[PDB]
Amino acid sequence: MKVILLEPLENLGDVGQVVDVKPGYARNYLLPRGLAVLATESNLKALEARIRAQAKRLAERKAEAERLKEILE
RNA sequence: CCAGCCUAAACCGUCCGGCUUGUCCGGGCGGGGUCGUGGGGCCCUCGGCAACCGAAUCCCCAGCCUAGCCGAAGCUGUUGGGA
Ligand SMILES: [Mg+2]
Ligand SMILES: [Mg+2]
Ligand SMILES: [Mg+2]
Ligand SMILES: [Mg+2]
Ligand SMILES: [Mg+2]
Ligand SMILES: [Mg+2]
Ligand SMILES: [Mg+2]
Ligand SMILES: [Mg+2]
Ligand SMILES: [Mg+2]
Ligand SMILES: [Mg+2]
Ligand SMILES: [Mg+2]
Ligand SMILES: [Mg+2]
Ligand SMILES: [Mg+2]
Ligand SMILES: [Mg+2]
Ligand SMILES: [Mg+2]
Ligand SMILES: [Mg+2]
Ligand SMILES: [Mg+2]
Ligand SMILES: [Mg+2]
Ligand SMILES: [Mg+2]
Ligand SMILES: [Mg+2]
Ligand SMILES: [Mg+2]
Ligand SMILES: [Mg+2]
Ligand SMILES: [Mg+2]
Ligand SMILES: [Mg+2]
Numbered sequence: 001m002k003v004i005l006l007e008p009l010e011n012l013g014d015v016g017q018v019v020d021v022k023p024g025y026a027r028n029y030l031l032p033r034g035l036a037v038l039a040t041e042s043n044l045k046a047l048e049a050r051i052r053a054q055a056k057r058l059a060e061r062k063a064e065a066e067r068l069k070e071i072l073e
Numbered sequence: 074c075c076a077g078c079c080u081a082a083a084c085c086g087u088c089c090g091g092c093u094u095g096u097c098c099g100g101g102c103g104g105g106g107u108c109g110u111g112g113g114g115c116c117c118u119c120g121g122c123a124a125c126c127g128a129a130u131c132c133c134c135a136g137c138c139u140a141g142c143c144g145a146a147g148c149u150g151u152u153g154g155g156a
């Protein structure tokens with residue numbers, strides 16, 4: 001069972017991270033407690049989004065602060 | 074006997090719901106697509122088509138079905154209860 005978890009669990013790993021688990025642990029616990037989600041191709045593709053989103057957002061907030069330093073120095 | 078066809082998916086637009094604004098997550102609608110010389114999508118170059126095909130869908134008609142109608146040519150005698 002592949003599931004991207006939405007919470008840092010000492011068991012599995014950190015948020016957003018994808019990891020393998022026994023189906024039971026997922027179907028009967030992680031899933032209902034919302035702690036994690038199915039690594040479905042649909043959701044997985046949407047996870048590639050948040051990465052690119054903030055990979056841009058950060059590589060631009062900092063990218064803009066590259067000119068401010070380019071003048072005060 | 075005779076005959077071949079429509080979609081799902083990639084792709085684009087829209088509507089509603091969702092987030093952490095992304096050619097992004099889902100749902101419905103429309104466009105796109107449909108085959109084994111493998112085909113389609115998206116990009117570059119040629120018509121930027123009159124045309125050529127065309128129904129298993131509609132519309133009119135013929136025909137046919139459910140009543141009908143026209144239709145040739147004979148008389149006499151005889152037996153017999155009756156020709
Ligand atoms: Mg489908
Ligand atoms: Mg598509
Ligand atoms: Mg669109
Ligand atoms: Mg859509
Ligand atoms: Mg709607
Ligand atoms: Mg909305
Ligand atoms: Mg959409
Ligand atoms: Mg469609
Ligand atoms: Mg078509
Ligand atoms: Mg079509
Ligand atoms: Mg084809
Ligand atoms: Mg080219
Ligand atoms: Mg052209
Ligand atoms: Mg052309
Ligand atoms: Mg023209
Ligand atoms: Mg006729
Ligand atoms: Mg007939
Ligand atoms: Mg009749
Ligand atoms: Mg008569
Ligand atoms: Mg008669
Ligand atoms: Mg006599
Ligand atoms: Mg007689
Ligand atoms: Mg007599
Ligand atoms: Mg007689």
